[PDB]
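Complex 218.
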Amino acid sequence: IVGGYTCGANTVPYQVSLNSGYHFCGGSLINSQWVVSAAHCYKSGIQVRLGEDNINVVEGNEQFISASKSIVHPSYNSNTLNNDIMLIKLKSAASLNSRVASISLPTSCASAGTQCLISGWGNTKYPDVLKCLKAPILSDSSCKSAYPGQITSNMFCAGYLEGGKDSCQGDSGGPVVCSGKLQGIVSWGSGCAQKNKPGVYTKVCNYVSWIKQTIASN
Ligand SMILES: [Ca+2]
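Predicted structure with calcium ion bound:
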């Protein structure tokens, strides 16, 4: 997260840290046993860390649960990054508090200019404290204006054309929550915080059926 601010301890209860010895990706707790992340963050061994703020110091609110299942979206594309979405099933049921809570799936797709909240432990140019960012949802055409012929259907732009505020490496798989709903997943972009190159996010609105089906199937 570039050009953002320190979130404040446990104000983002759904925000989790994907770990394999060291933080590499972020994620979103959508129910007690399932973390949603990015398909390009996939690896054999994944430990999901919840209730975090400083991931370098044990502060006494963390939950360390390994992943039972790592289900990459069947139609994931490695080049176009189409369907950059992945599901994680925890080894044990996560204990939900006020510091560890779920985030609601898209009730519907969000309007253009919807104020969102992006968060993650990614690069600011990795920090230790969680970084917060408030950015609006850009229109589909403006998203295609920035990325000509690169934007698919399951992608939208959330951020700024002015530059300075964007998601980056390490924030991948992180949440983009707009009005109580997880609308975007940190996917890709041309570097970070560059002008007219905002972050592209996986459109979670189009996967509620897929996500729910996968949960019921596992
Ligand atoms: Ca900690």
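The pocket of calcium ion is lined by residues 52, 54-55, 57-59, 62 (CB under 6 Å).
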